[PDB]
Structure formats: C-alpha cells, structure tokens
Amino acid sequence: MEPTRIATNDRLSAAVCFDALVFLSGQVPGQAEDIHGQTREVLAKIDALLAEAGSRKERILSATIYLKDIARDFAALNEVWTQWLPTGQAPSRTTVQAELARPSVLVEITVVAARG
Amino acid sequence: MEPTRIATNDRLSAAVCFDALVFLSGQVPGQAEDIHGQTREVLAKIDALLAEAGSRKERILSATIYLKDIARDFAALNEVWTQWLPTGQAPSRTTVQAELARPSVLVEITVVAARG
Amino acid sequence: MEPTRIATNDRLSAAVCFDALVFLSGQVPGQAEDIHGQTREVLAKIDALLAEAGSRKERILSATIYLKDIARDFAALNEVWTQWLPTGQAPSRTTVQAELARPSVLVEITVVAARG
C-alpha cells in the first residue's frame, strides 16, 4: 500500500494519505491580518483538506497550533477554535509559540486525522 | 472504525485513540515551579493518560518536548526524562524551544503511543 | 504487535517502527556550520534512517522542520529540501522557528514515514 498525495508542489503536499491516516501540511491564513480572521482562515483551509482527503472535522486525531505570540493571541485562538470544533468532539492538541515563515502570519495549524 | 476520546473539554481531549494509536495532548506541569519538578509532573500526567488509553511507557512511539528555555533547562529535562523512561526502551524524540501558554510553564511534552 | 527500535540510547531511539509506520527522532546536522551544509547533513541522516527502518524518501508522510532563524534561513532550507526530495513526491510539511539544543544548530527535521 502506497501513500497518496493532494496538492503537491516542489516543497510539500497539502495532504498525504496513508491507509486510514491523513497528514496535513501546516495551514496558514488567507488574507486576514488579525488573529481572529487568520484563525478562521486556517481552520477553513483545514476543513477543505479534510474533505478532499476523505476525512472530516469529527475525525481529527491531533492538532499542533503554532502562535507567533502565544501570550497575546491564545484567547482569540481558543475563541475561534472552540466554535469551529464539532461539539463534544475535540481532538488532542498542543499549542506553542513559534515564529512562522512570514512575520505577518500569526497562526498556523498542523492536523493529523482519520479517514472515514 | 471511529476515534475515541478521553477527557474532553471545549478545546481538546487529553487523549484520542484510533485503532492501535494513541494521540495525547501536550501535557503541562502540575504545581511545580522548577524545571525538575515540572518535568516530573508532566511525565506523571503522560503516564496516567497512557494507562487510561490502553498503552504504557514501553509503547511510546514519539515525543516532542517543548522547553521555554532550552539552553537553561535541557540538562535537567534529560536527567528526569532518562530516569522516567523504561530501560533500553526510549522512544523517538524531538526537543525544541517554544514559549508555552503560561510564562510559568517551563516544559510541555506531546506523546504518540501504541495501544497494547 | 510491538514497537521496534533503531539506535537506542538513554534519551531516544533514532527510529521507532510500529506496524507500517516509522517515527524518526529529530535529526540535527553533522559538522556543517552554514545553513545549506547543515540542511544537507540533516537530510542525509534522515535518508539513512529511512533505509534502516524499511522506508524510503518516497514514503515520507510528514516532516516538521525547525529553523533557529526562519526569516534568515527559510530560502536556503527550501533550496536544499526541494533538490533532496523525490520529484513530484513531496510529503506534508510544517516549517517553524525554534531554538535547538545547541546554539550552533540552525536546522532540525522530524519525519514520520510509511514502511515499504
């Protein structure tokens, strides 16, 4: 059995599927400049990739959430994140501070999920 | 087959199980203020979650260890970590610096393990 | 079924295998002092561990890439990384800034892959 890939470029594939597992690349925001908007955009991008890969939000296994400024933005992150999640079905998660590839990026989230 | 969850709140589940895999949320210390005590507390919390999820320390697959100050606390981390591990059965691991959600938190560890 | 380990010391195993999955410890450079050389060395070390564990570069599922200085070294990282990858077969990846265990280490990469 072989890995399959979704949205491949020279650096990464947006998703790699292997058996019943889905590995997503860290997703970054769209055009939003603020933390709330950026978190919404990251999570929307994750939701679409889960769909494309045969998974869904209820089948997320783990999320690592990277914040440029964890002290400043943790509460906003949690607000948007908890809304977006399916009720009673939150995944494992780890939230830490790390600078991302562009200084305007405030949040990036990496998800592993189960195929349905 | 569906993921199952242990200790779910609005943001996360302490553990998510899927087939033979166990994904733990990043664990943070208890009341300790010092690095040695905090590392002990994080590892004790991991040990209990592994038990609850049908795993054990000998079945850890990977650990990512986050230190607020890696230069300052790496040696203390390693001292406590190597004691806690089952002899000859260390997992894959990655240790990096990252600020955690509270400034008093010096160490946080995220584990993936195999069900028994 | 039990995890098996490659290159175990008191802190970590370079690789842990479990069923069809391979979990590698974060790999650090060899003797290089510059970002290009260091990235080459990290990736060479990963390639050997994949071989030892029954995998290969075409079966990488995820990579988390840690840069001491992401603003400064992202472009060099990408240059070496894209060369090293098998054409059209890039994995999922996440690239973030984090200080590593030694200040001279500029880059560290943690890989999960599929057994062949």
Side-chain angles (χ1 to χ4, degrees), chain A residues 1-46 48-116, chain B residues 1-46 48-116, chain C residues 1-46 48-116:
Chain A
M1 176 168 54
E2 271 200 323
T4 61
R5 309 181 177 81
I6 293 160
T8 302
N9 62 44
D10 292 333
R11 302 163 178 193
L12 58 82
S13 299
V16 177
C17 304
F18 181 62
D19 206 356
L21 293 177
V22 175
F23 299 78
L24 301 190
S25 288
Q27 294 304 299
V28 297
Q31 311 218 352
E33 308 170 342
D34 61 301
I35 178 69
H36 285 89
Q38 286 200 353
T39 303
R40 298 192 299 87
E41 298 182 343
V42 164
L43 294 176
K45 285 178 171 192
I46 286 173
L49 286 166
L50 293 176
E52 296 160 10
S55 191
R56 56 188 300 179
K57 304 200 282 191
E58 297 83 348
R59 296 181 76 79
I60 298 168
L61 301 175
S62 65
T64 297
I65 304 174
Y66 302 95
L67 294 167
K68 183 177 173 2
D69 190 330
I70 191 158
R72 186 168 183 174
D73 288 333
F74 191 55
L77 175 281
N78 279 331
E79 181 187 329
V80 177
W81 169 259
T82 52
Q83 293 177 335
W84 178 84
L85 282 180
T87 300
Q89 294 163 278
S92 73
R93 95 165 192 179
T94 300
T95 309
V96 306
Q97 179 166 292
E99 189 102 348
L100 297 320
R102 279 233 44 232
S104 75
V105 177
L106 305 178
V107 55
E108 172 166 357
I109 302 176
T110 305
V111 152
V112 180
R115 289 266 217 109
Chain B
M1 176 168 54
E2 271 200 323
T4 61
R5 309 181 177 81
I6 293 160
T8 302
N9 62 44
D10 292 333
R11 302 163 178 193
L12 58 82
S13 299
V16 177
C17 304
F18 181 62
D19 206 356
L21 293 177
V22 175
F23 299 78
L24 301 190
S25 288
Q27 294 304 299
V28 297
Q31 311 218 352
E33 308 170 342
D34 61 301
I35 178 69
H36 285 89
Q38 286 200 353
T39 303
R40 298 192 299 87
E41 298 182 343
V42 164
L43 294 176
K45 285 178 171 192
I46 286 173
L49 286 166
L50 293 176
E52 296 160 10
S55 191
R56 56 188 300 179
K57 304 200 282 191
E58 297 83 348
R59 296 181 76 79
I60 298 168
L61 301 175
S62 65
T64 297
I65 304 174
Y66 302 95
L67 294 167
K68 183 177 173 2
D69 190 330
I70 191 158
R72 186 168 183 174
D73 288 333
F74 191 55
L77 175 281
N78 279 331
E79 181 187 329
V80 177
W81 169 259
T82 52
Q83 293 177 335
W84 178 84
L85 282 180
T87 300
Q89 294 163 278
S92 73
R93 95 165 192 179
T94 300
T95 309
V96 306
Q97 179 166 292
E99 189 102 348
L100 297 320
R102 279 233 44 232
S104 75
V105 177
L106 305 178
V107 55
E108 172 166 357
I109 302 176
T110 305
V111 152
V112 180
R115 289 266 217 109
Chain C
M1 176 168 54
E2 271 200 323
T4 61
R5 309 181 177 81
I6 293 160
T8 302
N9 62 44
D10 292 333
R11 302 163 178 193
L12 58 82
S13 299
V16 177
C17 304
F18 181 62
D19 206 356
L21 293 177
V22 175
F23 299 78
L24 301 190
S25 288
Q27 294 304 299
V28 297
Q31 311 218 352
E33 308 170 342
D34 61 301
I35 178 69
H36 285 89
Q38 286 200 353
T39 303
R40 298 192 299 87
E41 298 182 343
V42 164
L43 294 176
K45 285 178 171 192
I46 286 173
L49 286 166
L50 293 176
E52 296 160 10
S55 191
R56 56 188 300 179
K57 304 200 282 191
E58 297 83 348
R59 296 181 76 79
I60 298 168
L61 301 175
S62 65
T64 297
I65 304 174
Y66 302 95
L67 294 167
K68 183 177 173 2
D69 190 330
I70 191 158
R72 186 168 183 174
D73 288 333
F74 191 55
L77 175 281
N78 279 331
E79 181 187 329
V80 177
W81 169 259
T82 52
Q83 293 177 335
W84 178 84
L85 282 180
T87 300
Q89 294 163 278
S92 73
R93 95 165 192 179
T94 300
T95 309
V96 306
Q97 179 166 292
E99 189 102 348
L100 297 320
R102 279 233 44 232
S104 75
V105 177
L106 305 178
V107 55
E108 172 166 357
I109 302 176
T110 305
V111 152
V112 180
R115 289 266 217 109

